[PDB]
Design an enzyme around this catalytic site. Structure first.
Site, PDB file in Angstrom:
ATOM      1  N   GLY A 113     -89.942  49.668  25.959  1.00 41.44           N
ATOM      2  CA  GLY A 113     -89.577  49.325  27.319  1.00 41.44           C
ATOM      3  C   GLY A 113     -90.203  48.026  27.784  1.00 41.44           C
ATOM      4  N   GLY A 114     -90.372  47.084  26.857  1.00 45.59           N
ATOM      5  CA  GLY A 114     -90.914  45.777  27.182  1.00 45.59           C
ATOM      6  C   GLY A 114     -92.330  45.783  27.711  1.00 45.59           C
ATOM      7  N   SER A 195     -88.945  49.127  19.613  1.00 44.96           N
ATOM      8  CA  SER A 195     -89.061  47.954  20.487  1.00 44.96           C
ATOM      9  C   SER A 195     -90.535  47.742  20.813  1.00 44.96           C
ATOM     10  CB  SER A 195     -88.131  48.139  21.689  1.00 44.96           C
ATOM     11  OG  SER A 195     -88.006  46.936  22.429  1.00 44.96           O
ATOM     12  N   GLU A 322     -78.988  43.274  17.830  1.00 45.55           N
ATOM     13  CA  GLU A 322     -80.158  43.450  18.686  1.00 45.55           C
ATOM     14  C   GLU A 322     -80.076  42.612  19.956  1.00 45.55           C
ATOM     15  OE1 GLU A 322     -83.062  45.978  16.376  1.00 45.55           O
ATOM     16  OE2 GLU A 322     -82.685  45.450  18.475  1.00 45.55           O
ATOM     17  N   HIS A 435     -79.519  47.176  20.591  1.00 39.99           N
ATOM     18  CA  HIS A 435     -80.935  47.508  20.681  1.00 39.99           C
ATOM     19  C   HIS A 435     -81.133  48.879  21.314  1.00 39.99           C
ATOM     20  CE1 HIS A 435     -85.152  46.406  20.622  1.00 39.99           C
ATOM     21  NE2 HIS A 435     -85.275  46.646  21.915  1.00 39.99           N
TER      22      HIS A 435
HETATM   23  C1  LIG Z   1     -84.004  49.739  28.001  1.00 39.13           C
HETATM   24  C2  LIG Z   1     -84.039  48.480  28.888  1.00 39.13           C
HETATM   25  N1  LIG Z   1     -83.388  47.251  28.274  1.00 39.13           N
HETATM   26  C3  LIG Z   1     -82.005  46.952  28.844  1.00 39.13           C
HETATM   27  C4  LIG Z   1     -81.310  48.089  29.611  1.00 39.13           C
HETATM   28  C5  LIG Z   1     -84.314  46.044  28.430  1.00 39.13           C
HETATM   29  C6  LIG Z   1     -83.600  44.670  28.491  1.00 39.13           C
HETATM   30  C7  LIG Z   1     -85.461  46.018  27.377  1.00 39.13           C
HETATM   31  N2  LIG Z   1     -86.657  45.222  27.708  1.00 39.13           N
HETATM   32  C8  LIG Z   1     -87.315  45.371  28.901  1.00 39.13           C
HETATM   33  C9  LIG Z   1     -87.394  46.611  29.548  1.00 39.13           C
HETATM   34  C10 LIG Z   1     -88.057  46.732  30.767  1.00 39.13           C
HETATM   35  C11 LIG Z   1     -88.653  45.616  31.350  1.00 39.13           C
HETATM   36  C12 LIG Z   1     -88.582  44.379  30.716  1.00 39.13           C
HETATM   37  C13 LIG Z   1     -87.915  44.253  29.499  1.00 39.13           C
HETATM   38  S1  LIG Z   1     -87.840  42.665  28.711  1.00 39.13           S
HETATM   39  C14 LIG Z   1     -87.886  43.275  27.044  1.00 39.13           C
HETATM   40  C15 LIG Z   1     -88.524  42.534  26.050  1.00 39.13           C
HETATM   41  C16 LIG Z   1     -88.561  43.011  24.739  1.00 39.13           C
HETATM   42  C17 LIG Z   1     -87.961  44.229  24.425  1.00 39.13           C
HETATM   43  C18 LIG Z   1     -87.322  44.974  25.416  1.00 39.13           C
HETATM   44  C19 LIG Z   1     -87.289  44.505  26.731  1.00 39.13           C
HETATM   45 ZN   LIG Z   2     -85.826  50.223  25.362  1.00 40.09          ZN
END
Ligand SMILES: CCN(CC)[C@H](C)CN1c2ccccc2Sc2ccccc21
Ligand SMILES: [Zn+2]
Ligand SMILES: *[C@@H]1O[C@H](CO[C@H]2O[C@@H](C)[C@@H](O)[C@@H](O)[C@@H]2O)[C@@H](O[C@@H]2O[C@H](CO)[C@@H](O)[C@H](O)[C@H]2NC(C)=O)[C@H](O)[C@H]1NC(C)=O
Ligand SMILES: *[C@@H]1O[C@H](CO[C@H]2O[C@@H](C)[C@@H](O)[C@@H](O)[C@@H]2O)[C@@H](O[C@@H]2O[C@H](CO)[C@@H](O)[C@H](O)[C@H]2NC(C)=O)[C@H](O)[C@H]1NC(C)=O
Ligand SMILES: *[C@@H]1O[C@H](CO[C@@H]2O[C@@H](C)[C@@H](O)[C@@H](O)[C@@H]2O)[C@@H](O)[C@H](O)[C@H]1NC(C)=O
Ligand SMILES: *[C@@H]1O[C@H](CO)[C@@H](O)[C@H](O)[C@H]1NC(C)=O
Ligand SMILES: *[C@@H]1O[C@H](CO)[C@@H](O)[C@H](O)[C@H]1NC(C)=O
Ligand SMILES: *[C@@H]1O[C@H](CO)[C@@H](O)[C@H](O)[C@H]1NC(C)=O
Ligand SMILES: [Cl-]
Ligand SMILES: [Cl-]
Ligand SMILES: [Cl-]
Ligand SMILES: [Cl-]
Ligand SMILES: [Cl-]
Ligand SMILES: [Cl-]
Ligand SMILES: [Cl-]
Length: 526
Positions: A113-114, A195, A322, A435
């Protein structure tokens, strides 16, 4: 059913899965709740209880900001928290086969979840299928995210950084101290995550404090050497001071800023987390892992290159598309409700979104490397090229480089290329094998015949579930019974990898060789 842990008794529930039984312990506390003066601190140990703790429902999710780009759309909301948000959130879950196993291998899940969002109570992280089908024990933990989990002023123990990583580590310690009472084997523990969870897994391979708390590791769509995964120590302090400014907590004595931040309620912290970065990207990680001198003793690229990590087997892999998920979060001309045919000019504007501080010459050579068409007439050329740029740079090439470096030190490694698009995928077809959409196959959701997955999807999920469990149990991800193709070891010379799909399974070599040569060797110099 009641199990005596070393801190007290817990009560679980029985679940009916595939004509059998699985026992579930949802919401076991593994740390003192990090409230008050304990906010931004590393997790503290839990104190005993003399009664029985009911562990019969998912606990609170950690404080986080929710995705609201597509309200009411299942494709994005399936990732949003499904329990109340609370700072009191450091709990874990345990799924046990029934009857009680004698010495079962343990799988520990770390969600992604980043580093900003995530919770272990998500439907696609339900470990009851794995416990039922392969008789392993599944554990998952909640860990702090965002500023409350990764805000850093290094050396300052009031806010040292990497608190969410230490949350995960304390959960691994809980398994070491308690899992035997559940019928599990603490000497057979495999971490797996996706992730940012996969990057966490790879950082546990580097951290000396985690080396004795697990046996093997699985990295799905992520690694620490990805460009989004580690926050520089310059950036960390800037974003800390920026958040203090935005809230009203700019002090001079640096310990006095944190006590000011501790008096703000969590909602004012969350609202200002977004603006600590001046010009971000769809892949921006506001507060993430840092070199803290504790969990991380040195810059992880140096430790990896010089062989300073836990020596064990690893399973690594990526999905075919991805990058596409991030394009509908800022790129011009992209949308989940059309087919997103973009022009050359819209491609060039996409690169500025994803590579904001890179030279004009740098974006030109990205365009040059990714616009050598087979068919010069296909309208989706630029649309598919931008997704491949984002996917290769942010996920695929870092994961391959990670596996190559890790295996150069004599360890068995296995790489996979997941290329099946789920028949229940709610995003449109142009986004492909996205992804995060291998997770439901790893957790065995297509095994539930009452869910509208295809018959071929049940077969592929059943095969992936067996490979993953065989890797955790024996360090070798083979499906030995149904005349499958053997998964070969990934070596730096030939670089073989296994493709996972319904139609076919094949051994191939040097995934994205040309594109990753550009990203890993040339691009760092522009
Ligand atoms: C499951 C959520 N996802 C899209 C719906 C996001 C874009 C994933 N994401 C993510 C999720 C929450 C907050 C920021 C980010 S920036 C990021 C960077 C690297 C891997 C994943 C993420
Ligand atoms: Zn995710
Ligand atoms: C370190 O942070 C400073 C201050 O950051 C401010 O940036 C604003 C855009 C906003 O997010 C606010 O909440 C935050 O406190 C950065 O200085 C800023 O940099 C941007 C981009 O170069 C400029 O547009 C601003 O004018 C500038 N403001 C000031 C007061 O200097 C600084 O660049 C940053 N360091 C980095 C990113 O390396
Ligand atoms: C694919 O969709 C994008 C997004 O357009 C949004 O706004 C409405 C038009 C709505 O119907 C829906 O398509 C979507 O929520 C289209 O890009 C838009 O194009 C207009 C035209 O001037 C611009 O003003 C918008 O800024 C732009 N939006 C974005 C996000 O770029 C795009 O044209 C479309 N492609 C097709 C239909 O082939
Ligand atoms: C449980 O099993 C333990 C041995 O586990 C094995 O140890 C090493 C070789 C790892 O490869 C691990 O995966 C293996 O499963 C025993 O030492 C222990 O006594 C056993 N305990 C019980 C209660 O059966
Ligand atoms: C825990 O669960 C048991 C069984 O449902 C219940 O009877 C008991 O009262 C619960 N304890 C609480 C709510 O403190
Ligand atoms: C900052 O405040 C802390 C807490 O009172 C104190 O221990 C420390 O000595 C102070 N340092 C400076 C430089 O003012
Ligand atoms: C092997 O094949 C049988 C049917 O022939 C099937 O029921 C079983 O699930 C398969 N095993 C695996 C691990 O896929
Ligand atoms: Cl071990
Ligand atoms: Cl960033
Ligand atoms: Cl491909
Ligand atoms: Cl041009
Ligand atoms: Cl080995
Ligand atoms: Cl090949
Ligand atoms: Cl290729």
């Amino acid at each position: 059913i009641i199990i005596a842990t070393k801190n007290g008794k817990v009560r679980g529930m029985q679940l009916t899965v595939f004509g059998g039984t699985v026992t579930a312990f949802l919401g076991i506390p593994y740390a003192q709740p990090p409230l008050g003066r304990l906010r931004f601190k590393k997790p503290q140990s839990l104190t005993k209880w003399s009664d029985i703790w009911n562990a019969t429902k998912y606990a609170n999710s950690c404080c986080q900001n929710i995705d609201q780009s597509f309200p009411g759309f299942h494709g994005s909301e399936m990732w949003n928290p499904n329990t109340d948000l609370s700072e009191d959130c450091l709990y874990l879950n345990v799924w046990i086969p029934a009857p009680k196993p004698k010495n079962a291998t343990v799988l520990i899940w770390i969600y992604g979840g980043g580093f900003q969002t995530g919770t272990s109570s998500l439907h696609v992280y339900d470990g009851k299928f794995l416990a039922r089908v392969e008789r392993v024990i599944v554990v998952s933990m909640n860990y702090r995210v965002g500023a409350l989990g990764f805000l850093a002023l290094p050396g300052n123990p009031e806010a040292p950084g990497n608190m969410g990583l230490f949350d995960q580590q304390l959960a691994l310690q809980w398994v070491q101290k308690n899992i035997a009472a559940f019928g599990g084997n603490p000497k057979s523990v495999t971490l797996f995550g996706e992730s940012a969870g996969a990057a966490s897994v790879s950082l546990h391979l580097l951290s000396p404090g985690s080396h004795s708390l697990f046996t093997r590791a699985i990295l799905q769509s992520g690694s620490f050497n990805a460009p989004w995964a580690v926050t520089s120590l310059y950036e960390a302090r800037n974003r800390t001071l920026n958040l203090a400014k935005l809230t009203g907590c700019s002090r001079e004595n640096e310990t006095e800023i944190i006590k000011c931040l501790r008096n703000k309620d969590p909602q004012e912290i969350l609202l200002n987390e977004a603006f600590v970065v001046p010009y971000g990207t769809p892949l921006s990680v506001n507060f993430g892992p840092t070199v803290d001198g504790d969990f991380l003793t040195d810059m992880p690229d140096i430790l990896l290159e010089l062989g300073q990590f836990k020596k064990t087997q690893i399973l690594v892999g990526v999905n075919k598309d991805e990058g596409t998920a991030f394009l509908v979060y800022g790129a011009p001309g992209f949308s989940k409700d059309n087919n997103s045919i973009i022009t050359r000019k819209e491609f060039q504007e996409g690169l500025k979104i994803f590579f904001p501080g890179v030279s004009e010459f740098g974006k030109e050579s990205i365009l040059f490397h990714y616009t050598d068409w087979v068919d010069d007439q296909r309208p989706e050329n630029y649309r598919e090229a931008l997704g491949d740029v984002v996917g290769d740079y942010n996920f695929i090439c870092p994961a391959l480089e990670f596996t190559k470096k890790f295996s150069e030190w004599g360890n068995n490694a296995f790489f996979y290329y997941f290329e099946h698009r789920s028949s229940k995928l709610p995003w449109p077809e142009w986004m492909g094998v996205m992804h995060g959409y291998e997770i439901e196959f790893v957790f065995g959701l297509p095994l539930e015949r009452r869910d509208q997955y295809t018959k071929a999807e049940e077969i592929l999920s059943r095969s992936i579930v067996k490979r993953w469990a065989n890797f955790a149990k024996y360090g070798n991800p083979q499906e030995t019974q149904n005349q499958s193709t053997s998964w070969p070891v990934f070596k730096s010379t030939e670089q073989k990898y296994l493709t996972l799909n319904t139609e076919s399974t094949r051994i191939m070599t040097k995934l994205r060789a040309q594109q990753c040569r550009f990203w890993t060797s040339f691009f760092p110099k522009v």
